[PDB]
Amino acid sequence: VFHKIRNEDLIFNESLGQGTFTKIFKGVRREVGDYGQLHETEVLLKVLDKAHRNYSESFFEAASMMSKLSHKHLVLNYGVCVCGDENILVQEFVKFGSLDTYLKKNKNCINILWKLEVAKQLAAAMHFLEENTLIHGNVCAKNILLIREEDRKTGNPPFIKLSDPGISITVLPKDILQERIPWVPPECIENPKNLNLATDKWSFGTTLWEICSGGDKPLSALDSQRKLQFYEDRHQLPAPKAAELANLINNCMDYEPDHRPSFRAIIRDLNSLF
Ligand SMILES: CC(C)CCN1c2nc(Nc3cc(F)c(O)c(F)c3)ncc2N(C)C(=O)C1C
């Protein structure tokens, strides 16, 4: 399952934000690295809420998903912290934070080519999961970490990684799922048991909309019931001003799950864009 990291090797520091029923901190880990060297390693510490330890199993299965596979675009898991009755996941710390908050703060000078490079790296990660038939279940700009910024000095592209999906939507209450529209596909709003490989194709289109919207959350002005109304009326997200990917967003966000393109074809269509 997971490697056990003991209490004394970890130091909890600043709170970075929240996940679903979790608190997230920047931490420091003392470890023996390569060649027996002692390392002070920055880590991420996801602490499942004391009130929500019900979801302890789903909390660790999502991390036991990125752990049993290895890929350059997947966030590394370090293990589980042993202390009290708490549930702590120890994961790779990324300096530049979420793509969600990065697209927002850098919306002014992120051009189409920057969005395209991040879009390909995300599709490449999803293509890797599709070939392994591994359902992620929570693709969004918040679960994406920016490891390297774009270097305009040498034209070096940015680099991203995809973190774990957190507690599965097949287990979360209905108020959270309806709040996650339009990231959760319409067939999962009807029934969370429809979680499938086609779910990640829909959520990829929503993330692709976030990337072209400069941090904007789709359907922010709509509440839960008007998001449920959004799906029943079979509406689609508005075309972003940076519209060179609205056709791919709408094609991925297909109300018929069996018609959403495979991430194979998504990459071809992405690569055929100047
Ligand atoms: C709650 C949100 C925001 C945490 C996002 N997040 C991560 N963030 C960071 N670095 C980070 C850097 C910052 F300068 C910062 O202000 C910040 F908040 C976070 N490293 C690893 C992750 N890993 C693995 C994750 O799964 C997730 C979800």
PDB file of N, CA and C and ligand atoms in Angstrom, residues 16-19 24 44 46 75 91-98 142-143 145 163-164, ligand 1:
ATOM      1  N   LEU A  16      -1.623  25.874   3.011  1.00  0.00           N
ATOM      2  CA  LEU A  16      -1.661  26.295   1.618  1.00  0.00           C
ATOM      3  C   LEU A  16      -3.073  26.408   1.062  1.00  0.00           C
ATOM      4  N   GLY A  17      -4.039  25.739   1.672  1.00  0.00           N
ATOM      5  CA  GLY A  17      -5.408  25.779   1.191  1.00  0.00           C
ATOM      6  C   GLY A  17      -6.175  24.565   1.685  1.00  0.00           C
ATOM      7  N   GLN A  18      -7.173  24.172   0.897  1.00  0.00           N
ATOM      8  CA  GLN A  18      -8.055  23.076   1.263  1.00  0.00           C
ATOM      9  C   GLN A  18      -8.373  22.232   0.041  1.00  0.00           C
ATOM     10  N   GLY A  19      -8.586  20.940   0.283  1.00  0.00           N
ATOM     11  CA  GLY A  19      -9.252  20.070  -0.653  1.00  0.00           C
ATOM     12  C   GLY A  19     -10.652  19.729  -0.182  1.00  0.00           C
ATOM     13  N   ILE A  24      -4.520  21.281   3.747  1.00  0.00           N
ATOM     14  CA  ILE A  24      -3.289  21.093   2.988  1.00  0.00           C
ATOM     15  C   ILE A  24      -2.238  22.069   3.500  1.00  0.00           C
ATOM     16  N   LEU A  44       4.384  18.064   0.628  1.00  0.00           N
ATOM     17  CA  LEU A  44       2.999  18.480   0.789  1.00  0.00           C
ATOM     18  C   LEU A  44       2.299  17.512   1.730  1.00  0.00           C
ATOM     19  N   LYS A  46      -1.411  16.493   3.005  1.00  0.00           N
ATOM     20  CA  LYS A  46      -2.866  16.523   2.939  1.00  0.00           C
ATOM     21  C   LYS A  46      -3.429  15.835   4.176  1.00  0.00           C
ATOM     22  N   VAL A  75       1.977  13.385 -10.060  1.00  0.00           N
ATOM     23  CA  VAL A  75       2.593  13.831  -8.816  1.00  0.00           C
ATOM     24  C   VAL A  75       3.102  12.632  -8.028  1.00  0.00           C
ATOM     25  N   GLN A  91       3.227  14.049  -0.100  1.00  0.00           N
ATOM     26  CA  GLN A  91       3.366  14.095  -1.546  1.00  0.00           C
ATOM     27  C   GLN A  91       4.395  15.142  -1.947  1.00  0.00           C
ATOM     28  N   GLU A  92       4.830  15.043  -3.202  1.00  0.00           N
ATOM     29  CA  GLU A  92       5.816  15.963  -3.751  1.00  0.00           C
ATOM     30  C   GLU A  92       5.325  17.401  -3.659  1.00  0.00           C
ATOM     31  N   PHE A  93       6.175  18.281  -3.135  1.00  0.00           N
ATOM     32  CA  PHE A  93       5.851  19.699  -3.074  1.00  0.00           C
ATOM     33  C   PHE A  93       6.327  20.389  -4.344  1.00  0.00           C
ATOM     34  N   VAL A  94       5.443  21.186  -4.934  1.00  0.00           N
ATOM     35  CA  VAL A  94       5.719  21.938  -6.151  1.00  0.00           C
ATOM     36  C   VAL A  94       5.741  23.415  -5.788  1.00  0.00           C
ATOM     37  N   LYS A  95       6.780  24.125  -6.237  1.00  0.00           N
ATOM     38  CA  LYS A  95       6.993  25.489  -5.758  1.00  0.00           C
ATOM     39  C   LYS A  95       5.925  26.447  -6.274  1.00  0.00           C
ATOM     40  N   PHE A  96       5.578  26.358  -7.555  1.00  0.00           N
ATOM     41  CA  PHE A  96       4.729  27.357  -8.190  1.00  0.00           C
ATOM     42  C   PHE A  96       3.236  27.096  -8.000  1.00  0.00           C
ATOM     43  N   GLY A  97       2.864  26.116  -7.179  1.00  0.00           N
ATOM     44  CA  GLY A  97       1.472  25.963  -6.795  1.00  0.00           C
ATOM     45  C   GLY A  97       0.563  25.433  -7.896  1.00  0.00           C
ATOM     46  N   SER A  98      -0.726  25.721  -7.728  1.00  0.00           N
ATOM     47  CA  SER A  98      -1.755  25.212  -8.622  1.00  0.00           C
ATOM     48  C   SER A  98      -1.749  25.945  -9.956  1.00  0.00           C
ATOM     49  N   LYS A 142      -7.168  22.968 -10.538  1.00  0.00           N
ATOM     50  CA  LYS A 142      -6.687  22.983  -9.162  1.00  0.00           C
ATOM     51  C   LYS A 142      -5.829  21.765  -8.844  1.00  0.00           C
ATOM     52  N   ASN A 143      -6.117  20.621  -9.462  1.00  0.00           N
ATOM     53  CA  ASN A 143      -5.336  19.408  -9.261  1.00  0.00           C
ATOM     54  C   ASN A 143      -4.107  19.341 -10.159  1.00  0.00           C
ATOM     55  N   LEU A 145      -0.288  20.918 -10.956  1.00  0.00           N
ATOM     56  CA  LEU A 145       0.808  21.625 -10.311  1.00  0.00           C
ATOM     57  C   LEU A 145       1.846  22.033 -11.346  1.00  0.00           C
ATOM     58  N   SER A 163      -2.131  15.787  -9.934  1.00  0.00           N
ATOM     59  CA  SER A 163      -2.188  15.213  -8.600  1.00  0.00           C
ATOM     60  C   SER A 163      -3.327  14.199  -8.505  1.00  0.00           C
ATOM     61  N   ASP A 164      -3.520  13.645  -7.307  1.00  0.00           N
ATOM     62  CA  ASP A 164      -4.558  12.649  -7.109  1.00  0.00           C
ATOM     63  C   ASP A 164      -5.939  13.309  -7.075  1.00  0.00           C
TER      64      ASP A 164
HETATM   65  C1  LIG B   1      -4.436  23.739  -1.544  1.00  0.00           C
HETATM   66  C2  LIG B   1      -3.718  23.786  -2.891  1.00  0.00           C
HETATM   67  C3  LIG B   1      -3.320  25.216  -3.255  1.00  0.00           C
HETATM   68  C4  LIG B   1      -2.506  22.849  -2.908  1.00  0.00           C
HETATM   69  C5  LIG B   1      -2.192  22.405  -4.341  1.00  0.00           C
HETATM   70  N1  LIG B   1      -1.403  21.176  -4.388  1.00  0.00           N
HETATM   71  C6  LIG B   1      -0.036  21.241  -4.308  1.00  0.00           C
HETATM   72  N2  LIG B   1       0.635  22.435  -4.176  1.00  0.00           N
HETATM   73  C7  LIG B   1       1.965  22.473  -4.097  1.00  0.00           C
HETATM   74  N3  LIG B   1       2.717  23.724  -3.956  1.00  0.00           N
HETATM   75  C8  LIG B   1       2.207  25.033  -3.561  1.00  0.00           C
HETATM   76  C9  LIG B   1       3.044  26.128  -3.729  1.00  0.00           C
HETATM   77  C10 LIG B   1       2.625  27.400  -3.375  1.00  0.00           C
HETATM   78  F1  LIG B   1       3.455  28.468  -3.551  1.00  0.00           F
HETATM   79  C11 LIG B   1       1.360  27.584  -2.840  1.00  0.00           C
HETATM   80  O1  LIG B   1       0.934  28.870  -2.478  1.00  0.00           O
HETATM   81  C12 LIG B   1       0.520  26.493  -2.664  1.00  0.00           C
HETATM   82  F2  LIG B   1      -0.725  26.678  -2.138  1.00  0.00           F
HETATM   83  C13 LIG B   1       0.942  25.218  -3.021  1.00  0.00           C
HETATM   84  N4  LIG B   1       2.689  21.360  -4.150  1.00  0.00           N
HETATM   85  C14 LIG B   1       2.128  20.165  -4.281  1.00  0.00           C
HETATM   86  C15 LIG B   1       0.700  20.093  -4.367  1.00  0.00           C
HETATM   87  N5  LIG B   1       0.083  18.880  -4.501  1.00  0.00           N
HETATM   88  C16 LIG B   1       0.866  17.655  -4.560  1.00  0.00           C
HETATM   89  C17 LIG B   1      -1.241  18.829  -4.577  1.00  0.00           C
HETATM   90  O2  LIG B   1      -1.868  17.589  -4.714  1.00  0.00           O
HETATM   91  C18 LIG B   1      -2.012  19.995  -4.524  1.00  0.00           C
HETATM   92  C19 LIG B   1      -3.536  19.897  -4.617  1.00  0.00           C
END
